[PDB]
Design a protein around this nucleic acid. Structure first.
Ligand SMILES: Nc1nc2c(ncn2[C@@H]2O[C@H](COP(=O)(O)OP(=O)(O)NP(=O)(O)O)[C@@H](O)[C@H]2O)c(=O)[nH]1
Lengths: 118, 122, 53, 114, 252, 206
RNA sequence: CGGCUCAUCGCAUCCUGGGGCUGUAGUCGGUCCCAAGGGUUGGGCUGUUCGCCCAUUAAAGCGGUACGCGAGCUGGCAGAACGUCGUGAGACAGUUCGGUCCCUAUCCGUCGCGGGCGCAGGAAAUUUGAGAGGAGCUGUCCUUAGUACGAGAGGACCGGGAUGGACGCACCGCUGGUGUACCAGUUGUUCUGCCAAGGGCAUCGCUGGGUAGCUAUGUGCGGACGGGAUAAGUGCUGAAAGCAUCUAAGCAUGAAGCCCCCCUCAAGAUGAGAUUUCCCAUUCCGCAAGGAAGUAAGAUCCCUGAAAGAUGAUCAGGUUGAUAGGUCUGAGGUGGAAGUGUGGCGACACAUGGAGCUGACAGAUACUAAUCGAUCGAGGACUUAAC
């Protein structure tokens, strides 16, 4: 696994907020290396969504930050998983995302990509 | 894993208490002695009325290692309190009788007089 | 340490040889385009293997 | 290691009993000093239960005349004759390392029989 | 048991054993006979020399002096604090050495050596009226007309009676030696003296048990009621060198 | 002087009719198939081209495609020879397995070492440390190159370089057990090579 | 200055090998040649070389290279105390403490790793081995054997057989260490509305463990068998020299030296090796000499990875696919989840249940990601022989 350029306490918080930002907007522009590591933790989030246990909720609750997720429903990031994300991915086993890569930006040299839910 | 300048304890009734190593007899240059090696020794604390006295320099045999005495046969032995027997010249100790157990690693060499006085051999 | 000499007008021109960077990979787009870096979605059309994204 | 585990069961011994990591069992060790086998029965408490298939292992601590004796008897070895349990003891964990220190009256709290 | 600090120094210094007229030897007043030096006994021949037994603070001293005097050597006891016995050593440098005083106004240069920590560094400042240097440890310095404050000690190293005056190094050479032996002199010669310093009623036989009887009165414990041996080694040598037990002898 | 060569898998223990908890290696290779006979009068000396772990046509190549039709075997990988084998029982197309080795026979291994990456002077050349305290910052550095009057460096003085990726011979090893059905050789001791890498198992050169 | 790293080097040898002569009955010895291949210590106490002590060992070899090595390390002049000298200012190969010597490597050397180009066509593999490097130590013990020996005691030689140390090479299955996204226990506050259960931070909060990988103190293994030529010699044959001779002719013999045998790198060994197998002998411009332009065989760009790795490269792989991740089924690890129920005044216990959880470890599985494409890359010159 990639150290992602930050320290460990930063590293665990580096990605949890991405997962909130993932399942809300469904489609993120991101630095591809951070994107390349992220797909192997949020599929563990989605498959943990596909249990439906209350015990399945709390393990996500230790991970997913309680952002207000979808407007005018007050659907939480937790409450968007098991009511909408699980039923959107009932049949497909594995491979819930992909990394279509993009070019580099102007003032970094950093290669880019796009993470969606598919 | 005894070394030079290692604190050892008495296991026989020699009256001695604390033993500081000087040099490992086994081989030449090496300072690591596991079990049964001959270890020349000095004495930091002793009971007075006995065979030897305080600060005497004698020879001795390791009995107890905290490090792993390991057989070829897969078995393992490690003691807690690193003790040592106070021998004189040959493989016969200068002690009267042994405080506590000695491992069964003295079979390889001819130390089969201290094994006779053992309360336990494991 | 110190550069003891000026380096030459030769060897400086003889140092930059393996410095000049390679051509990046260029592939012809499969829909409306002219050039696009291999394996990655072009920014012109925004399509990849028959998929608008 | 799927192409290894097949050879292992053929040499494996099943005649063991299963046991918790923190307990007291007795073991019989076949010893070959000369020509006579001094089959001895070593009993006491156990600490380690580090696995290994072929190399499943455990440790036996036994106080002896004022000092404990760590025993690293191999689970998969014919020199073991028989393992016989004594105390199904309540132990919080699978690593009783700290009773290399509290050697005295701390063997009771860790040996709540069950 | 000592480096090129006393033996090596004396070796090169021994080269000035012809310009020296009177030699001043030094032995301990507590123990006379072991406090000689058999290396300097071989370099110092055919010279009048006077023996001195300093820190005299008497019955055993005088007795030994009588035998020593008849031995061929003159013994004069001096002091380090008071001015007593210095009125017989000053006039002896021009009387005993009358062979080199009126034979030719030549100087009287003296060589002062012997055993360390027994009264060698304090032999210059009271023969003069000014301090020069001083150490309370085993070592000293490395320096009438006098340039003499070195040390003889022992080139190669009976020692049980030696270190009770602390004439050698004791950082770590041996500390249990003075413990196991020195109380026997308090047992064998003056058994009544121990009954008051720590308040013991009767001296027991186990010399290790008398440590714990002393040490629990002391309080230099180590862990959980256990009295430390090595600290109780210190409180015995701390008292015998300050003469807390009084005036005691060694050899008879 | 015989030899198979095959991949390794892991490390195990096997005790056989004694307490001997012997560390054993996981050397499992398929029946080697003589590729091409080197004869002395044609190619300077005698040898046996051997193959192992044959792949499929995805990694095949018209050079290596005709390399095997003389032997009539699928295109495999790791094609090595054996300078020491007999030139009698090793014809073109012959198949050799583990049925050659049995119990109590000295073996030899030459295998590719682990690549530890670009280490320092310490773990490559066995260089010890300097003093870590007492004012000296100096440690973990290979010391002076040597004298002054040469005004140069002796080629052979140690220095931190990349260590690994070269072969290692280990002689005087023994076999504890053979199993022909899983095609497994078991070697007492330890054998150089990371997992899934080829191991020449040649007869222990007495 | 002395050490620390590290070395290499001489022989005038410290031990181990090979013989000589003595005061070597046998064991054990001093002393003189051969010999530089390895190997040659750890403490107190010393500024520390000087010296002293202890324990060692097969023995702690002398010496050189800016008294080997400070752009690699290691302070290890002003103020004072002093004594002494000079009236004093101030002196001193006089004594004690306090006391800051800088560097990003350009070049050459080194240790690696690449890229170009060569090797009269490309490729793909396999190798040859001139030449270079590494390896070269021994101690105890057991037989033979108390045999050979000697008034005795003593007690081998030659030669087998165990077992160590040092040192080198490999490796994680044992044995332990490590593990910063694993596991639970717990403090302090804050945080999701509260309770419960959780998150954040506090050296990774702290303490108890630990997969993987990397590791030594752990484990395996090495220094064998030997041949060939030589030293000192040991000799045989005999000349010079009617005897005779180690020597001149001519033979042997004989050392851990030295070649070679083990190992490793080695055809950029410009002498560019050699087999095996591919691959075609195009289209074209120029009278021709030739020059291009497409392409094979094939490699690569590019992409997912690690057995690899500072990057390059190497290696596994690129949709007739298991390279990676996910998914499962597992392993190993910690080990008794939550919820609920019971019991307890409660703190908590017990039940459902070796539970729940898990980072690189397995094994299946096209579910995602390796698309779609592009580029490079040969038509084999010239003598002469044999065919
Ligand atoms: N009471 C008493 N004390 C004395 C006597 N002599 C010396 N001392 C004290 O014991 C200490 C040691 O004396 P010293 O002369 O420095 O010993 P040293 O033998 O000269 N040492 P070094 O040979 O190394 O210079 C001094 O400090 C002094 O005060 C004495 O005769 N009587």
């Amino acid at each position: 696994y990639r150290k992602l350029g930050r320290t460990s306490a930063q590293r665990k918080a580096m990605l949890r907020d991405l997962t909130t930002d993932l399942i809300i907007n469904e489609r993120i522009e991101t630095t591809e290396t951070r994107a390349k590591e992220l797909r192997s933790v949020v599929e563990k989030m989605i498959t943990l969504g596909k249990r439906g246990d209350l015990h399945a909720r709390r393990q996500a609750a230790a991970y997913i930050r309680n952002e207000v997720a979808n407007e005018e429903n007050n659907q939480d990031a937790l409450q968007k998983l098991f009511s909408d994300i699980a039923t959107r991915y009932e049949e497909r086993q594995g491979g819930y995302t992909r990394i279509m890569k993009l070019g580099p930006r102007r003032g970094d040299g950093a290669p880019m990509a796009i993470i969606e839910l598919v | 894993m005894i070394q030079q300048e290692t604190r050892l304890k008495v296991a026989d009734n020699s009256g001695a208490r604390e033993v500081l190593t000087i040099k490992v007899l086994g081989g030449s240059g090496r300072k690591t002695a596991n079990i049964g090696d001959v270890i020349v020794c000095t004495v930091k604390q002793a009971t007075p009325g006995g065979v030897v006295k305080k600060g005497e320099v004698v020879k001795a045999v390791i009995v107890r290692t905290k490090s792993g005495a390991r057989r070829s046969d897969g078995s393992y032995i490690s003691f807690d309190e690193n003790a040592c027997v106070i021998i004189r010249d040959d493989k016969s100790p200068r002690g009267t009788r042994i405080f506590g157990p000695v491992a069964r690693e003295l079979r390889e060499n001819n130390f089969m007089k201290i094994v006779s006085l053992a309360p336990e051999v494991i | 340490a110190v550069p003891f000499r000026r380096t030459s007008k030769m060897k400086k021109r003889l140092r930059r040889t393996h410095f000049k960077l390679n051509v990046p990979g260029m592939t012809e787009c499969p829909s409306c385009g002219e050039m696009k870096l291999s394996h990655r979605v072009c920014k012109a059309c925004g399509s990849y293997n028959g998929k608008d994204i | 290691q799927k192409l290894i585990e097949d050879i292992t069961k053929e040499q494996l011994r099943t005649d063991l009993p299963a046991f918790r990591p923190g307990d007291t069992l007795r073991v019989h060790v076949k010893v070959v000093e000369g020509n006579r086998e001094r089959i001895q029965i070593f009993e006491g408490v156990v600490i380690k239960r580090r696995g290994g298939g072929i190399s499943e292992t455990f440790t036996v601590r036994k106080i002896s005349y004022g000092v404990g004796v760590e025993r690293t008897f191999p689970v998969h070895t014919p020199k073991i004759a028989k393992i016989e349990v004594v105390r199904y003891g309540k132990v919080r964990r699978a690593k009783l390392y700290y009773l290399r220190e509290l050697r005295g009256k701390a063997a009771r709290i860790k040996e709540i029989r069950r | 048991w000592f480096p090129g600090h006393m033996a090596k120094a004396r070796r090169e210094v021994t080269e000035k054993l012809k310009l020296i007229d009177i030699v001043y030897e030094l032995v301990d007043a507590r123990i006379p006979m072991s406090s000689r030096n058999p290396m300097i006994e071989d370099i110092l021949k055919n010279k009048p020399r006077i023996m001195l037994l300093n820190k005299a603070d008497a019955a055993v001293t005088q007795q030994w002096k009588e035998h020593f005097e008849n031995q061929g050597i003159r013994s004069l006891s001096i002091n380090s604090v008071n001015g007593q016995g210095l009125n017989q050593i000053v006039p002896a440098s021009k009387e005993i050495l009358q062979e080199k005083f009126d034979r030719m106004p030549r100087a009287i240069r003296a060589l002062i050596i012997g055993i360390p920590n027994v009264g060698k560094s304090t032999l210059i400042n009271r023969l003069a009226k000014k301090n020069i240097a001083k150490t309370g440890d085993r070592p000293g310095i490395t320096t009438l007309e006098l340039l003499d404050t070195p040390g003889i000690l022992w080139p190669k190293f009976v020692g049980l009676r030696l270190a009770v005056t602390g004439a050698i190094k004791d950082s770590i050479i041996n500390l249990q030696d003075v413990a196991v032996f020195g109380l026997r002199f308090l047992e064998e010669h003056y058994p009544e003296r121990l009954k008051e310093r720590y308040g013991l009623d009767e001296i027991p036989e186990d010399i290790a048990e008398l440590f714990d009887a002393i040490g629990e009165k002391r309080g230099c414990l180590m862990s959980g009621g256990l009295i430390n041996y090595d600290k109780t080694t210190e409180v015995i040598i701390r008292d015998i060198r300050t003469e807390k037990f009084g005036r005691l002898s060694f050899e008879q | 002087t015989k030899g198979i060569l095959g991949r390794k898998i892991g490390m195990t223990q096997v005790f056989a009719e004694n307490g001997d908890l012997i560390p054993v290696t996981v050397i499992e290779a398929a029946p080697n198939v003589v590729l091409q006979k080197k004869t002395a009068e044609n190619d300077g000396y005698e040898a046996i081209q051997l193959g192992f772990d044959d792949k499929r046509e995805k990694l095949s190549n018209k050079p290596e495609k005709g390399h095997v039709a003389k032997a009539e075997t699928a295109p495999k990988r790791f094609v090595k020879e054996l300078r020491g084998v007999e030139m009698d029982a090793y014809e073109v197309g012959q198949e050799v397995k583990v049925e050659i080795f049995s119990a109590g026979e000295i073996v030899d291994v030459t295998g590719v070492s682990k690549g530890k990456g670009f280490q320092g002077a310490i773990k490559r050349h066995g260089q010890s440390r300097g003093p870590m305290s007492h004012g000296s910052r100096y440690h973990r550095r290979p010391g002076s190159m040597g004298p002054v009057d040469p005004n140069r460096v002796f080629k052979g003085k140690l220095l931190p370089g990349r260590m690994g990726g070269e072969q290692i011979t280990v002689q005087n090893l023994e076999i504890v057990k053979v199993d022909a059905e899983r095609n497994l050789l078991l070697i007492k001791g330890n054998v150089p090579g990371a997992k899934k890498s080829l191991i020449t198992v040649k007869s222990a050169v007495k």
